[PDB]
Amino acid sequence: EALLEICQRRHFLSGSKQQLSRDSLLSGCHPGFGPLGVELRKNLAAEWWTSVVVFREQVFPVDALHHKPGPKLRENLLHGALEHYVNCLDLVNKRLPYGLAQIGVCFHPVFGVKSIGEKTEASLVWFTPPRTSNQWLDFWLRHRLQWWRKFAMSPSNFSSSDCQDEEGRKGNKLYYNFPWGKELIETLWNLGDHELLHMYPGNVSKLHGRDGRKNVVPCVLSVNGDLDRGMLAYLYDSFQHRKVLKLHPCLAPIKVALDVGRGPTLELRQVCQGLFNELLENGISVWPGYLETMQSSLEQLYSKYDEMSILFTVLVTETTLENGLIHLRSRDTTMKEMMHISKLKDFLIKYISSAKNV
């Protein structure tokens, strides 16, 4: 709709005129991403790795090869995690069931001639005994659903479906309502030991891990989420005469932007540079609109900063060079406020830290 056009003028996506359709975006075919989309994906992947690093006991990060080891590109992100299974058995001391998480750029064929598409997906291979495989699968189902639910503006938009077959005893797929069509966002399967037993026969005496004075070949849980589809999901979830993207604070790429109000004066640039350094010193993404070079209107400026999903806009007028007061302006409430420049850092940090809840 009118969302795909505000992602072009605000550089969420790459420059395109024909491959800007929803079908091409759902496809791996690209025209990749603009800086905003890249930062959004990086924050998303960071929160993904954070939502699995808090998980007890221990999950080890790995990286798989992209091409075929014997000469070709990878489709799934399971094989490379299965290759490092026997190795990562030593680090866990073969003690308990354990997993391996990894985020990578996987490929898939897209159909004149046919081409190839890319997608950045995050996978988790959870090795666990067959008797406690299904329960842990339901566990991961709940935790992943809640994971998508946290940063969501609406929990009803994300759905969870159950399924099964002959190869997979029980599997679950996480869908997302658009609502132009519910789409796949993440797959959760419960593959048997067959996949692992196929690449190590044998003598298979290495594969079985200890499970309380018991030797047993572990069943394999296949978690596989898409961060591109997730990015688009949150983008469509944030789209709200107003055209403002209300992305989650912890997820939003740029969370603050500061310009000047008084005419082009060096001192204003000095103060703004100071605030720039102070805000970047505490890990706060800030857009520098004080460069500037003209500072035309304020309404189209706020419109631009709202289409870029900036949490707070800051204005450094000439009064700031006297009292230190500065012009804040929210996004979710769009309230024109004013506060001292020294208490800005603490306010932003506290506001970001207050968004940490489940």
Binding site: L96, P97, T128, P129, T132, Q135, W136, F139, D211, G212, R213, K214, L266, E267, Q270, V271, T320, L321, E322, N323, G324, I341
Partner: protein
């Protein structure tokens, strides 16, 4: 042509003054000495139309010039002397700008205090400087108090604008400002930073005090100790340069009170306004005391320094000017970055060595370490007190699953954790340093509650006394030590006994690992104490040392580090590289404060010469500004310049970090600096003081002939002739000669020449004995040389003859002592007496060397003044734009423009010629040699430096950065006359 060297001059037709007997004695002297192998190489004579002389001699020329150049300022000073003082106001006005206090101390809002002359002392809050905040100035008419814009609470942004105090009056005579350390106040003047100007000059009471009744640093050291038989008679006739002390000296009134809180340097802007009235009062007391002191000093200074040349010379020497731009800020940033990087590397390596050496604490294996056994090696674990009771020991008091139903057990463990946390805080008190680590490691760490805490062991050094012993091997030996001196190095049988006993309890001292280390070293008390290197057992004593001071630590022994002995381990070339790192940042370590804090005011595009704007340089949104060097006009000795930063500014070395500091003074576009370096001044001065005393001509001495014989251009000077003996070129030979003139001590010349030549002591001693011929000879029981033909006699009464003393043969130290024996002013020539504390009247005086040095260096400073007034005389008379001066003792650089540079260099040559002729005339005859009349090197370019070609370290590429090139000069500048119409 003629008389072994003279040029075409119109400075007096006669003249000889032949002195046939005298020149017969000189020729006979120079024959037996003996030098009679003349090279006969006549320098190209120059024929040019000299500027108009005023007559009769050049003495009255320079006198009239100096008088007319300093007449208005003398008038103004006289207006200050006969000034009737109006009383201090009952209250100070709290308003921005100037406030005039006239009748009954009323408050009259004024922008600029229009006065012929006034005293001045500015104030500045150091907490957020270097911007002026307060000022007080009294005048022969009334009082004035200036306040800065710091009266309104704002969040200012200091980029050093034109905020400093305004003092100069507009046109569309004239000014004189006196004050204690007047240069600092000058640096806070709004109109002194402009490229053009200025009519306003300054008079320093500190410099004046130094000229009248000054004293050496050695005298200062024991003057303040007042809290060598007749060395305490000058204690009450002179004083230190402090304002309270100089006031207690020249006024002798009640002791002025100083600020007990030091609020301008200890406190902020907040606590200043709370005590504004008081601080204003203090400033008023300061300017008042300064006024009194000035009033009492002016006639005294005029008496002791009768010649106006010194006056005008002191006037122009105070108005220095250094033009700069953004490249200054870039220089600061880059140099500081480099410094922080190298320091990061060094401290990283050292703390790495300190960390891996901390492991040998367990268990008691440090006692075997031949380097690490002197220090602490402590193990603390304190402390706690009992509060829980009673009578029970608190020291001893595989299932697979998948549970998650306890979702809130995490916050249970959290609550348990926090509840456990806030119950132990009252058990200790003040967080001490880490007790687990040894004492030597605790001292090598920053405090935990320190705002600038860095991880691991910091404060590593270089040049400490723990870390050098921590790693370095020691001169073909193993252990190094310190007590009264560190490892002995640089700056008929003898025996010494030995001993070894135990008694308990002292620290265990190993000496087997030492012997084994020596075994490992030679694997590739006596003997081996002379030239080889070895350590004994305990004792401890010298037992074979050369230096009588020691050297903690070896920081300038690179050739004695990159030749085998000595080396470090572990290990490899880490030693010489560490020494390299030390040598690189040696300058920036002891100057970065002075350089970074060195303020600079930027002038906007509205207050600069538009003729520069027309010049094809802006440059690309570039900021142009400047800084006044802030120099004490006259400091001992003799009345030389004294400046914290720019006088100790490092030269252009490809090794030092901030070595570009000298070449950062970049002249504005359209302008260029033209300067020159006297080659040579003090040597030729001593020469003249010898030949003029011996006879009439300039080449009638053994020493004074070689000075004016060599040429630096494709030739060999006297310094260069002594440097090619060999010999070391060239500054070293200079510091050998000039050190010989002012006391050629046998052991000093020994260790010096041996330090510079790097050889063996016997041949060196032979060379010294060969060179000690110059000072030889000299003068009941006594030295076997008197006025009588023989010393041996029987009961011969001659106590009336033991009053004469003087050397013989080559040198002329007899005259330098002749000026050092007079109990009367001793002022040659000119011609200004100094210090009631060094004058042998009522002084022992036992300060001979300082007085010889006083003589020759005073000749150098009067030379400087003469150069100044001479350069000023033909810069205003002719169309030569840019009169701003930048002088460093011998060298002197003027800020001219690109179209008047050659004529300015010509002015420099003329100046040098006239000054040399002055020194020649003051002793006779007016005739002067050839290879000494004119400058040999005249630098003409954008930034000032040493040689015309300049390389550097921090920016790596000089011309790579926005620079140009230099031009040697020369003989080609002798075609552009002083007249405007040239080329």
């Amino acid at each position: 042509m003629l008389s072994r060297g003279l040029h075409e001059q119109i400075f007096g037709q006669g003249g000889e003054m032949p002195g046939e007997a005298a020149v017969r004695r000189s020729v006979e002297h120079l024959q037996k000495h003996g030098l009679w192998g003349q090279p006969a190489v006549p320098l190209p004579d120059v024929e040019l139309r000299l500027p108009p002389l005023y007559g009769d001699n050049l003495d009255q020329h320079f006198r009239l010039l100096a008088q007319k150049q300093s007449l208005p300022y003398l008038e103004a000073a006289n207006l200050l002397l006969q000034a009737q003082l109006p009383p201090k106001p009952p209250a100070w006005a709290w308003a921005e700008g100037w406030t005039r206090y006239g009748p009954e101390g009323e408050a009259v809002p004024v922008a600029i205090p229009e006065e012929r002359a006034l005293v001045f002392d500015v104030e500045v809050c150091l907490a957020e400087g270097t911007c002026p905040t307060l000022a007080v100035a009294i005048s022969p008419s009334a009082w004035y108090s200036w306040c800065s814009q710091r009266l309104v609470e704002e969040r200012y942004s200091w980029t050093s604008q034109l905020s400093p105090a305004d003092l100069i009056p507009l046109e569309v005579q004239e000014q004189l400002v006196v004050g204690h350390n007047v240069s600092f106040d000058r640096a806070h003047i709004r109109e002194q930073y402009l490229i053009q100007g200025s009519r306003m000059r300054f008079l320093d009471t500190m410099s004046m005090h130094m000229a009248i009744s000054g004293l050496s640093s050695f005298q200062r050291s024991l003057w303040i100790a007042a809290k060598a038989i007749s060395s305490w008679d000058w204690l009450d006739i002179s004083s230190v340069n402090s304002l309270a002390e100089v006031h207690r000296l020249y006024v002798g009134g009640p002791p002025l009170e100083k600020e007990p809180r030091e609020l301008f340097v200890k406190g902020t802007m907040k606590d200043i306004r709370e005590n504004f009235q008081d601080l204003m009062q203090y400033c008023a007391q300061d300017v008042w005391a300064t006024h009194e002191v000035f009033q009492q000093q002016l006639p005294l200074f005029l008496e002791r320094c009768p010649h106006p040349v010194t006056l005008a010379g002191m006037l122009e020497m105070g108005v220095s000017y250094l033009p700069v731009n953004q490249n200054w800020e870039r220089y600061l940033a880059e140099a500081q970055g480099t410094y922080e990087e190298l320091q990061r590397e060094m401290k990283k390596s050292l703390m790495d060595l300190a960390n891996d050496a901390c492991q040998l604490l367990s268990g008691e294996r440090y006692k075997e370490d031949p380097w690490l056994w002197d220090l602490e090696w402590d193990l603390q674990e304190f402390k706690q007190k009992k509060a829980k009771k009673v009578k029970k020991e608190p020291a001893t008091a595989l299932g697979p699953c998948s549970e998650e139903e306890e979702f809130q057990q995490d916050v249970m463990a959290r609550a348990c954790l926090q509840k456990l946390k806030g119950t132990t805080e009252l058990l200790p008190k003040r967080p001490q340093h880490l007790p687990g680590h040894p004492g030597w490691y605790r001292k090598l760490c920053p405090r935990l509650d320190d705002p600038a805490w860095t991880p691991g062991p910091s404060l590593l050094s270089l040049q400490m006394r723990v870390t050098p012993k921590l790693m370095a091997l020691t001169w073909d030996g193993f252990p190094l030590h310190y007590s009264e001196r560190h490892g002995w190095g640089y700056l008929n049988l003898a025996k010494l006994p030995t001993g070894t006993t135990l008694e308990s309890a002292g620290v265990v001292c190993p000496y087997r690992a030492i012997e084994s280390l020596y075994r490992k070293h030679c694997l590739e008390p006596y003997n081996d104490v002379d030239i080889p290197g070895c350590w004994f057992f305990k004792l401890p004593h010298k037992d074979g040392n050369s230096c009588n001071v020691g050297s903690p630590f070896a920081k300038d022994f690179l050739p004695k580090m990159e030749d085998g002995t000595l080396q470090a381990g572990p290990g490899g070339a880490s030693g010489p590289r560490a020494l390299e790192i030390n040598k690189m940042i040696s300058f920036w370590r002891n100057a970065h404060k002075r350089i970074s804090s060195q303020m600079v005011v930027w002038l906007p595009r509205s207050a600069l010469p538009r003729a520069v704007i027309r010049h094809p340089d802006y440059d690309e949104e570039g900021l142009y500004g400047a800084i006044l060097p802030q120099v004490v006009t006259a400091g001992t000795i003799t009345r030389r310049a004294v400046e914290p930063t720019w006088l100790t500014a490092s030269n252009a070395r490809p090794d030092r970090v901030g070595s570009e500091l000298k070449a950062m003074v970049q002249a504005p576009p359209g302008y260029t600096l033209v300067g020159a370096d006297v080659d040579s001044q003090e040597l030729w001065i001593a020469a003249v003081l010898g030949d003029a005393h011996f006879a009439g001509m300039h080449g009638c001495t053994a020493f004074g002939w070689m000075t004016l014989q060599g040429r630096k251009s494709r030739g060999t000077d006297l310094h260069s002739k002594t440097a090619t003996t060999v010999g070391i070129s060239r500054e070293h030979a200079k510091r050998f000669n000039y050190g010989r003139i002012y006391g050629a001590g046998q052991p000093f010349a020994e260790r010096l020449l041996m330090q510079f030549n790097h050889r063996l002591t016997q041949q060196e001693a032979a060379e010294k004995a060969q060179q000690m011929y110059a000072a030889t000879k000299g003068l009941l029981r006594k030295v076997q040389r008197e006025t009588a033909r023989k010393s041996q006699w029987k009961k011969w009464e001659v106590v009336a003859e033991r009053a004469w003393k003087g050397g013989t043969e080559s040198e002329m130290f007899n005259k330098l002592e002749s000026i050092a024996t007079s109990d009367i002013p001793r002022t040659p020539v000119l011609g200004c007496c100094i210090s009631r504390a060094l004058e042998p009247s009522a002084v022992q005086e036992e300060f001979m060397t300082s007085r010889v040095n006083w003589v020759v260096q005073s000749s150098a400073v009067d030379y400087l003044h003469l150069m100044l007034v001479a350069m000023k005389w033909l810069f205003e008379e002719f169309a030569i734009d840019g009169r701003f001066c930048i002088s460093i003792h011998d060298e002197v650089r003027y800020l001219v423009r690109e179209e008047d540079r050659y004529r300015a260099a010509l002015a420099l040559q003329i100046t040098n010629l006239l000054t040399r002729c002055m020194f020649a005339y003051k002793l006779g005859l007016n005739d002067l040699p050839q290879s000494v009349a004119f400058f040999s090197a005249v630098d003409i370019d954008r930034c000032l430096r040493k040689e015309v070609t300049m390389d550097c370290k921090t920016p790596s590429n000089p011309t790579g950065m926005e620079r140009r090139y230099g031009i040697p000069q020369g003989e080609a500048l002798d075609i552009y006359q002083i007249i405007e119409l040239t080329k």
